[PDB]
Design a protein around this ligand. Structure first.
Ligand SMILES: [Mg+2]
Ligand SMILES: [Mg+2]
Ligand SMILES: [Mg+2]
Ligand SMILES: [Mg+2]
Ligand SMILES: [Mg+2]
Ligand SMILES: [Mg+2]
Ligand SMILES: [Mg+2]
Ligand SMILES: [Mg+2]
Ligand SMILES: [Mg+2]
Ligand SMILES: [Mg+2]
Ligand SMILES: [Mg+2]
Ligand SMILES: [Mg+2]
Ligand SMILES: [Mg+2]
Ligand SMILES: [Mg+2]
Ligand SMILES: [Mg+2]
Ligand SMILES: [Mg+2]
Ligand SMILES: [Mg+2]
Ligand SMILES: [Mg+2]
Ligand SMILES: [Mg+2]
Ligand SMILES: [Mg+2]
Ligand SMILES: [Mg+2]
Ligand SMILES: [Mg+2]
Ligand SMILES: [Mg+2]
Ligand SMILES: [Mg+2]
Ligand SMILES: [Mg+2]
Ligand SMILES: [Mg+2]
Ligand SMILES: [Mg+2]
Ligand SMILES: [Mg+2]
Ligand SMILES: [Mg+2]
Ligand SMILES: [Mg+2]
Ligand SMILES: [Mg+2]
Ligand SMILES: [Mg+2]
Ligand SMILES: [Mg+2]
Ligand SMILES: [Mg+2]
Ligand SMILES: [Mg+2]
Ligand SMILES: [Mg+2]
Ligand SMILES: [Mg+2]
Ligand SMILES: [Mg+2]
Ligand SMILES: [Mg+2]
Ligand SMILES: [Mg+2]
Lengths: 271, 46
RNA sequence: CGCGGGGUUGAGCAGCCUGGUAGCUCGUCGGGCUCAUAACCCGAAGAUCGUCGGUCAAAUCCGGCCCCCGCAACCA
RNA sequence: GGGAGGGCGCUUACCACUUUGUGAUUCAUGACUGGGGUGAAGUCGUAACAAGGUAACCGUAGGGGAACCUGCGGUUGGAU
RNA sequence: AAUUCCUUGUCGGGUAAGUUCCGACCUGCACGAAUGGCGUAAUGAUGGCCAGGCUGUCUCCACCCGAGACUCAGUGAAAU
RNA sequence: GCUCGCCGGAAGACCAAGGGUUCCUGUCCAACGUUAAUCGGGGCAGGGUGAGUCGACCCCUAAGGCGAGGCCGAAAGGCGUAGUCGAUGGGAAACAGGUUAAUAUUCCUGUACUUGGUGUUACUGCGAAGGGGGGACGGAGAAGGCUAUGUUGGCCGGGCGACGGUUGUCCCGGUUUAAGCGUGUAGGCUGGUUUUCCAGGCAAAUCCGGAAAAUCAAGGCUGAGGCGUGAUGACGAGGCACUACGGUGCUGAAGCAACAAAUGCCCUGCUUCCAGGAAAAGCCUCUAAGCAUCAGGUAACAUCAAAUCGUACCCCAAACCGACACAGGUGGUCAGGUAGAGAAUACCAAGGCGCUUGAGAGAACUCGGGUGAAGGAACUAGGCAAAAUGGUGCCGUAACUUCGGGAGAAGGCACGCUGAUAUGUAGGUGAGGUCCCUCGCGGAUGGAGCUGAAAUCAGUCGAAGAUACCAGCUGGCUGCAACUGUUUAUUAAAAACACAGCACUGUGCAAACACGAAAGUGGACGUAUACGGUGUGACGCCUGCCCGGUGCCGGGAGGUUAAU
RNA sequence: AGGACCGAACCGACUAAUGUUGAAAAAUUAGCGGAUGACUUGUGGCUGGGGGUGAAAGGCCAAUCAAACCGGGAGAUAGCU
RNA sequence: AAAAUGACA
């Protein structure tokens, strides 16, 4: 539900929250939590490699099962939960034998639905089965790239992947970006479409709302001095240069992909 | 006014201490220079 | 008050480019279609190249004069 | 001898001139400016009346020196 | 005009007198549409102008209470 | 020694970091002390730091460092696995009184507490690098119950007033008691017990997990405070003698109740919100290999051990960082009375200080302040500086607007003291009785005493009743920036930077990009509703025309074109 | 509920005066802004010089920054004093 | 296919 806050303060005028009453408001399942340490963008050498990272709120990583390698064994959804590490809410899943795990929550999964994985599972949202068995033309998510990897496609909040064609031992996928990949037909893909579709319709509202998410301020090039950034310089907002990244590589148009090893699996590039 | 030298024994021994010199080759040539010069107290260690 | 572009039949614009060769559009004049005016058709005239001066010859080379249009006049 | 009661005076309450601070409504006035009306052979076109030479009009949007043009939906109060 | 050289442009308001301020005109040397255009309630140790209260800021200074300056005893520098 | 003045959320008392004898006696004044000094944080000599319970050491880990093998690298060397280190975090236990010139939760008195070895006895399946639980965690907010603590009354001891009264509703002081052990309350959590089964917790499992059946409406866990005991003990105002005239030596009455009450405890609780809030060990439990005599496990009894290091002194400053005995800087804990909303402010108690040159005079001139005739911004770049408003309650409040605001708009009125309402009200607290009780730290009824607003009526004093300290100046028009924030430590706090929002563009995961000769890492334990770069900067109405130039993208015919 | 309001601790530095061989190699006095947050602070870590870090001033990197400090090349060179 | 206009009296 999208809720626009009444303007009782100069800085709460443009706040649009997304609220979900179904989310469990207790505490996460303890035996599936780890320690998640922040970095601020620093690596081994201690220098920043990616900018605008640091600060925020402490978080605890939750071990989400992506492989879904439990054939048979029907399982029941216990409760939906809010996952700070991702953009899509998670669901606690209790299998019949008594083992509990975490899964991504598709949009059509309530608290009490039944799921089951394997090559014999039914065609319903929440079931996992290879795209050899998945009917052509379907909409799926959590798509794997290599058999047994775990899943790298359509994992964000509200995304989906369309199975276009099935060419022999390969399956062609239309992705959210617009690309059309070819993957091996033996990869698994959890059927449905990821939930929390209203994730766009949320404006943070204020600087502190971004700051308490580990997003430090960013400074434009034209304010910089000529030493610190190629744009730099100027007596009162002079630009006179082709836009570039701080390291000289041209932005605004220049393609920067060069792989030559996965080009065999690209049917039509994004457009 | 907060001055530059704010003492701390623990921070001093971890940085300019004897075992801080001996742990690196550059910090081991530092001692050899002091021994050749003939200094009374080698590194800092009171 | 230093440095520049320009002055061509009524108007605008080429021809000054290495010196002999003055053109395009609009316009004007006389005829023609129309009841009549525009529009259209057929024909003609229109400048000595701002002036004053200096090679067989000068709109074109050069200098002064007249006018217009530009730029620069800065560091304390 | 004085007493009761009254009067003059003092004080309190109600209240009229008067002084403030904010509005509300109405009448005049104002550099400039929007639209309207009248008026003389003014300038640019010709939108409408005939099938007015692209049928006209209605609501809406965009555009243009002006009548107006075009898109979308609607009417016949359109000639053959 | 945070942009206008001529410029204190011209007209109007406020003042006895307004190069500044507010409103209008357009003759934009050299505004103008995400190196954004035009508005905008609230906010501001932000820029400009005006009014009420208030007063030594001022006409124009006068008096008073303290710490130095001045005399006595002790210690006793610096620039050049 | 008697007066005077100052601080009193500090200029009082206790720590950590830091310092290293500055602590206490005796002695000295050459040098140090911004003067003299008989004095000192100065010289000299001597003395002083007493721990099973306080810390350190020790067990366990975070960020992170080092890193056997290992990967990579001209040499040095870089990264990293197993591990081992690393507190600012988690892990057992002691409190009162007395005592020194200097130490004391360390010495003495009294009373306790924790973990281990060995021995005796009584039972007994014990057993781990592994499994499970627990340790184990956010911000705001709201009351309820208490305590620290204070005020008053009672009791006890003392006093009868340097000057008008003061045998009384009079004045002064005291009225203290710990850790531990027992009971378990106000409250807060969960239903409990038994039987059977199994794709999970790599192995196993009586334990967690999961599925049923039957049974009972109860059990269990947590828990401030209070009440007993410790305590016929210690402490206690003062009375009694030497006075080494510094104190020592002797004895010792009362030692209760009511009310107010925290930012402290129950509270690691409860309600709610999004930005979703450490790890490991100690501890409990389960089995594997192994041993079924053992060994080991639980309980009671007795004894032994608890080693080593710090312990003085200053700690918001004369002892630390500033060259100084410097108007500067430095983290945590305690929080008395009156007026007050308050840790602001004013005066005080405990306690500590008068700041290491003084004595005179009372010129100009400078610094800090008080008051001013008439005028009231006439000063000046500019109302800079000064002056002024300033509190509670109530009436009332415009244009504009994103409907929240503007707004404390503006402008006003009442404010002390006494009495009555009411010999102190409304309210709060609640004792005697009184009834019942699953019989206890119990449930009603009950209204003695204590406490105590706010408002009206009448009167009264002053020139003035928010009287002192404290404590908004207010309106009108306008540019820029939407706003809260950040910036040139040390002449620029803004219109500059950031910001939520918008758009372009790259990026299919071994992602683009960045740090690295490389291994590797951040991106990210993320996966196009995601991530990086660029420009603009809330919101409203909008964002026109040009691809000639310089770039970017796509094209693949034709010309030119390298190494070989 | 609030990057909400008034206002102490705490943080900061807008105006004026004093001080400019200062009490102080940037402070005192009287006023001033924030004061539940993009806040503030204790302890310990990581980033190293053509590099770090930077809500961006060429700011900060031990009273020093348009390229720190120390040692070495080094008695660098000086048509200039 | 192009095909505009004409004071009043
Ligand atoms: Mg700049
Ligand atoms: Mg550059
Ligand atoms: Mg410019
Ligand atoms: Mg027509
Ligand atoms: Mg027509
Ligand atoms: Mg702008
Ligand atoms: Mg001298
Ligand atoms: Mg005092
Ligand atoms: Mg000494
Ligand atoms: Mg002396
Ligand atoms: Mg001494
Ligand atoms: Mg290493
Ligand atoms: Mg090695
Ligand atoms: Mg360790
Ligand atoms: Mg610790
Ligand atoms: Mg002592
Ligand atoms: Mg001590
Ligand atoms: Mg100094
Ligand atoms: Mg002194
Ligand atoms: Mg001091
Ligand atoms: Mg005070
Ligand atoms: Mg005087
Ligand atoms: Mg005065
Ligand atoms: Mg007087
Ligand atoms: Mg006066
Ligand atoms: Mg007067
Ligand atoms: Mg004047
Ligand atoms: Mg004046
Ligand atoms: Mg004043
Ligand atoms: Mg601003
Ligand atoms: Mg601000
Ligand atoms: Mg400043
Ligand atoms: Mg900008
Ligand atoms: Mg544009
Ligand atoms: Mg606030
Ligand atoms: Mg405030
Ligand atoms: Mg510096
Ligand atoms: Mg250099
Ligand atoms: Mg050399
Ligand atoms: Mg030399």
């Amino acid at each position: 539900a999208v809720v626009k806050c009444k303007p009782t303060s100069p800085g709460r005028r443009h706040v649009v929250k997304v609220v979900n009453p179904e989310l469990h408001k207790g505490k996460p399942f303890a035996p599936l939590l780890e320690k998640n340490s922040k970095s601020g963008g620093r690596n081994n050498n201690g220098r920043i490699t990616t900018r605008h990272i640091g600060g925020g709120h402490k978080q605890a990583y939750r071990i989400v099962d992506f492989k879904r390698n439990k054939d048979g064994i029907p399982a029941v959804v216990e409760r939906l939960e809010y996952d700070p590490n991702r953009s899509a809410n998670i669901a606690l899943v209790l299998y019949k034998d008594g083992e509990r795990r975490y899964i991504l929550a598709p949009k059509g999964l309530k608290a009490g639905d039944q799921i089951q994985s394997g090559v014999d599972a039914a065609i319903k949202p929440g079931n996992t089965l290879p795209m050899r068995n998945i009917p052509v033309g379907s909409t799926v998510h959590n798509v794997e790239m290599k058999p047994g990897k775990g899943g790298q496609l359509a994992r964000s909040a509200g995304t989906y992947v369309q199975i276009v064609a099935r060419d022999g031992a390969y399956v062609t996928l239309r992705l959210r970006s617009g690309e059309m990949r070819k993957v091996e037909a033996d990869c698994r893909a959890t059927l449905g479409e990821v939930g929390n579709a209203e994730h766009m319709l949320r404006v943070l509202g204020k600087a502190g709302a971004a700051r308490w998410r580990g997003v430090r301020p960013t400074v434009r090039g034209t304010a910089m001095n000529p030493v610190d950034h190629p744009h730099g310089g100027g007596e009162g907002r002079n630009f006179g240069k082709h836009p570039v990244t701080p390291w000289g590589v041209q932005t605004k148009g220049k393609k920067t992909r060069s792989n030559k090893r996965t080009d065999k699996f690209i049917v039509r590039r994004r457009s | 006014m907060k001055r530059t030298f704010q003492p701390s024994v623990l921070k001093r021994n971890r940085s300019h201490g004897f075992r801080a010199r001996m742990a690196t080759k550059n910090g081991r040539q530092v001692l050899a220079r002091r021994r050749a010069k003939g200094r009374a107290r080698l590194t800092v260690s009171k």
